[PDB]
Amino acid sequence: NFEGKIALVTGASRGIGRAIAETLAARGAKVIGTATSENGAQAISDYLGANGKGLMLNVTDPASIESVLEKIRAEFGEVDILVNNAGITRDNLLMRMKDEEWNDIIETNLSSVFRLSKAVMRAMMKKRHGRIITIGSVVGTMGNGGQANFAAAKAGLIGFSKSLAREVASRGITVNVVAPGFIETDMTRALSDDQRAGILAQVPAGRLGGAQEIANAVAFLASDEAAYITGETLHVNGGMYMV
Amino acid sequence: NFEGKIALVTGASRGIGRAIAETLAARGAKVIGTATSENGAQAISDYLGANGKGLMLNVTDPASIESVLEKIRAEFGEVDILVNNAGITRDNLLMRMKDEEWNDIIETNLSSVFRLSKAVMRAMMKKRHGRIITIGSVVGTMGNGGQANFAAAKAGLIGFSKSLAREVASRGITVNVVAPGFIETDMTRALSDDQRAGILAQVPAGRLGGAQEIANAVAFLASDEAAYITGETLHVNGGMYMV
Amino acid sequence: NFEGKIALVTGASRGIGRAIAETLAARGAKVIGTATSENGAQAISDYLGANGKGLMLNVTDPASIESVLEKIRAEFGEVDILVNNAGITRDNLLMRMKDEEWNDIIETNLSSVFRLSKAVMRAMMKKRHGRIITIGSVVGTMGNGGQANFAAAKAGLIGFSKSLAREVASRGITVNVVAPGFIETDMTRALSDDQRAGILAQVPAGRLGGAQEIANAVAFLASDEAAYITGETLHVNGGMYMV
Amino acid sequence: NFEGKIALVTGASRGIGRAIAETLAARGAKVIGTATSENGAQAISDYLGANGKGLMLNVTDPASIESVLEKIRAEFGEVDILVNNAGITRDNLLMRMKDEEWNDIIETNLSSVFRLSKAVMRAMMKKRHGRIITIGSVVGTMGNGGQANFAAAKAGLIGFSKSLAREVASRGITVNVVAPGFIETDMTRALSDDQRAGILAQVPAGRLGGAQEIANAVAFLASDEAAYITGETLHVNGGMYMV
C-alpha cells in the first residue's frame, strides 16, 4: 500500500512504463508519469486521472529535469519513489554503429539514471526513506550482438545503483534494478512472425513476459515489504537467463 | 492472496520458517509447517490454527518424506507451493571439519532440496502450475571462512534450481531462491554487543534483517505476480553483497 | 615453469584430465595422474613416463584417498598443486532421476572436492604456498535441463572453493575453478551429428573448445603468475555463457 | 609469445599500463604504449626501446584516435592486440558529484572502449584473429560508495565487451575484461600505514596486488592459449570479491 507516497515514473507512455504508473496508482500512490511531448504527457494524465498527472520531460536535458521536479514539488510534493524507465535503442553491429547512436544511448539510458537519482536524493535522505528503481534489461547481463551500446548502459546502471545503494543504505533508501527479459510491447509486436519464434526459443517459459509482470516486481521493490533489498538486481525473464 | 493454494513449509518452527508459514497463511493459503519433533509439529499446529497443520518431517529420511506428503494429500490435497527452509549449520575451518559435519550439511541442506522438489513435482506438472522456493544464503554466493560445507550446499541448491527451472518452466512452474543476509534470530539476539557490531559493520543498511522481510520476498515469489520469475535468486541482505 | 612442484591430477585418463597432466608435466612438474583401475593407472604412467606416475584412486573412498597420498609422499613428496578433475554424469529429468544417480553425482563430483582438498591442505599451509583447482562446468552456472544433479555439484564446488579460499588466502594458497563449456571429448564424439549441431548453435565461437585449451587455463592458474587470483571462477566456453 | 603480433596499450605510462606494455614486449610483441603528453610518449618509447614506441593519444578525441592508429599502421602495421587501460577517477558522493565529473569518467572510462574497439575491429576481422582486453575493476562488480561514476563505467565496459564478443566470436576474436582489486600504485604507496591497513583488511590475501600480476593475466588472455575465452571477466583481486 503506497498511501501518501509520491512516485515519479519516467517514460510512462506505454507498456512497462504505463503498467508501472497504473499499478503504483492502483495501490494508493500519487503518480507522475512522463513523456517527451505535451501530447504524451496529456495522455498519461488522462489514464491516471485523479491519481496523478502527466508531465513532459527529457531525461537528457538538465533544465527539463529540474523544471519537471519543481512542478512536482509545487503540485504534489517531494518524490518518494523514483522509477527510471525512460530509455531507447539504437541497435547496430559495432562496425556500423554511429557515434550519435552510442552517445544517445549512453546519455538517455545511463546518464539519465545519474541525473534523476541525484535530483531526488536530498529529499529522500532528509525523510530518511526512499525508493529508486531502474528498469534494466537481461541484455545488460548477458550482452547481445548488435546492442553493444544498449548493453553498456544497462550493465552500467547496475554498477551505478550498487554504488549509490552503498551511500544511502543506512539512510533508509534502497536502490535496485529490475531486469526484464523479452516483454510484449511495440518493439516485439513489430517483429516478423519468425523473429518472434526465434525469441521464444530462448525462453524456457515459452512465452513473452507481460508489461504488468514487470510492474508487479517494481511495486514489490517499491513497497515497505522490500526494505532489506538494496543494490540488488531482480531478473524477470522467464528463465531466459539465470544468474 | 493464495486462496485455495496449499503450501508446505519445511522447518517452520521459528524465525524465517515460521514467518513464512504465518505470512502464507495470513494471505489465504492452507499451510503445512514441519518440525523434527512431535512437539514442534504441535506448536506449529497451534500457531497456524485452522489455517494449517504441523507435521513431523525429516528431510533426509525418504520414508518420512513419503509419509508426510501422504498425510497432506489425505487431509488437504496436492502441494502447490513448496518452501524448502529446513537446514542446519556445522561450522568449522576445513582442517577441523568432521566427515559427519560435511555429510550432514549436504544431506540436510542440499539433498533435501532434491528429495522434496522431486516429491511434489508430478502433481504440479499436472496442474500446469506450481511454486518451488528454497531459502538459500548470501554465504552460498560469497562463501565464508569456516562454512565451506554450508556454502557448498547453498551454492549447490541454486545450481539445482536453475536446472529444474529449465525442465518445468513451460509447465507453469517456477523454481527460485531467496538468499537472506544476516537475519535476526535467537543465535544473534544472544550475542554480545561487540559481536553484533562486527556483523552490523558488514551490512550497509546498518541492522540485521527481519525474519518477516524474508517471508515477504517468498510470498511475492510464491504469488501469481511472479509467474515470469524462475531460475532466479533474490538477495535480501541489506546490501551486504550485491550481484 | 613448475620445476620442483608436485601436482596431483585426479581422473587424468583422457581429455581434459590428460591434457592437464601432460601440460603440467611438459612445464616441469612431477605429475601424478589417477584412474579407477590398475589398467588406467598404468596407461597414465606410460604417457607421463619419467615425468610422473599413474595411481589408482577412488575419490569417494576415504581409504583410497589417504592410501594414494601416502604413496605420493613416499615416492615424490608433498602435493603442491591439486587439480580436481575426477567427475561423472548421471543425466535424467528430475522426474526420472534415481536416488543413486543423485547420491553418486554428489559424492563423486562435490564431496570429492572436500575430501581431497582437505587431504592436501596441511602440507600446503606449512609451506605457505599451494594451488587447488577444480574443473567445474558452465552448467554449474547456468544450470541445464536433465542435469539437476550435475549442476548442483558444479555450483556447489564453487561455493566450497570460495569459502576455502577465504580460509587459506593469507597462507599463500589459492583455490579457484575453471569452468569449461562444451569440450570435444568422448561424451561429445558419441553424440549424433544433430546433437553436435545443436551444441554449436549455443556457442558464439562456433566450435567446441579443446581439452588442451582447458589445460592452458589450469596451468596459468597453477603458476606463480596467478598468485593474486583466488576464489575466482575462470569460464572457458567460447562465449556460450558470459558472467 | 606474440612473435609478429602488434599490441596497442592505452595509458601505458606507469603501473598496470606499463607492466602490460613491458610484459607483452618481453614476450615478443611490438608494443605501442600511449600517454596524454609528448613527454609520456617519449618516456614510454625510452623504456620500450626497440620493442615499441610511445605515442600521444586522447581516448576521448576521435581525431587523436584516428591519428594515432594512422601512425601505427604506417610504422608497424595493423593492431592485433588492443589493451584498453586508459582511465581516470573523479571520486565523490553522489550529492557532491559534478556533472563534469560524471561526464569525464564516462567519456574516458566507458566511451573510450567503444571508440578504440571499433577503430581496430575491421583489420582484426579480416585477419580472422584478434584480442581486445579492457582493464576493468572490482568496483564495477561490487560498486563502491563515492565512486558511482567509476563503477558505472567499469560495469558498463563489461556489458559492452559481452555484446561485442558475441558479434565477433566466430571470427576468431576474443573480447575480455581483467578486473583488478586493490593494486599497489603511487596513490597507495603514499598512504599512511593506517589507511593501508584499512584496505588490507578487505583483502583475504593480506596485501595489495602487483601491477605485474595484472599484466600476467592480460598476457594470458592475449595469447593463443586463451582462444576459447571470450565475453569473460577475469577477477584478479586476492579474494577481495568472489563471483
Curated annotation (Swiss-Prot), chains A, B, C, D:
Activity regulation behaviour: Inhibited by cinnamic acid derivatives.
Catalytic reaction list: a (3R)-hydroxyacyl-[ACP] + NADP(+) = a 3-oxoacyl-[ACP] + NADPH + H(+); 3-oxobutanoyl-[ACP] + NADPH + H(+) = (3R)-hydroxybutanoyl-[ACP] + NADP(+); 3-oxopentanoyl-[ACP] + NADPH + H(+) = (3R)-hydroxypentanoyl-[ACP] + NADP(+); 3-oxohexanoyl-[ACP] + NADPH + H(+) = (3R)-hydroxyhexanoyl-[ACP] + NADP(+)
EC code: 1.1.1.100
Binding site for NADP(+): 11-14, 36, 58-59, 85, 150-154, 183
Disulfide bridge positions per record: none
One Pfam family recorded for the sequence: adh_short_C2
Protein family: Belongs to the short-chain dehydrogenases/reductases (SDR) family.
UniProt-annotated binding residues for Ca(2+) 1: 49, 52
Protein keywords: Calcium, Fatty acid biosynthesis, Fatty acid metabolism, Lipid biosynthesis, Lipid metabolism, Metal-binding, NADP, Oxidoreductase
Assembly notes: Homotetramer.
One Gene Ontology molecular-function label: NAD binding
Active site: 150
Residue positions binding Ca(2+) 3: 232-233
One biological process term in Gene Ontology: biotin biosynthetic process
Outcome of swapping residue 153 to T: Decreases in the thermolability of the reductase
InterPro entries for the chain: 3oxo_ACP_reduc, NAD(P)-bd_dom_sf, Sc_DH/Rdtase_CS, SDR, SDR_fam
Primary role: Catalyzes the NADPH-dependent reduction of beta-ketoacyl-ACP substrates to beta-hydroxyacyl-ACP products, the first reductive step in the elongation cycle of fatty acid biosynthesis.
Name of this chain's protein: 3-oxoacyl-[acyl-carrier-protein] reductase FabG
Gene coding for it: fabG
Other facts: Calcium ions stabilize the structure, and may inhibit FabG activity by obstructing access to the active site.
Binding-site list for Ca(2+) 2: 144
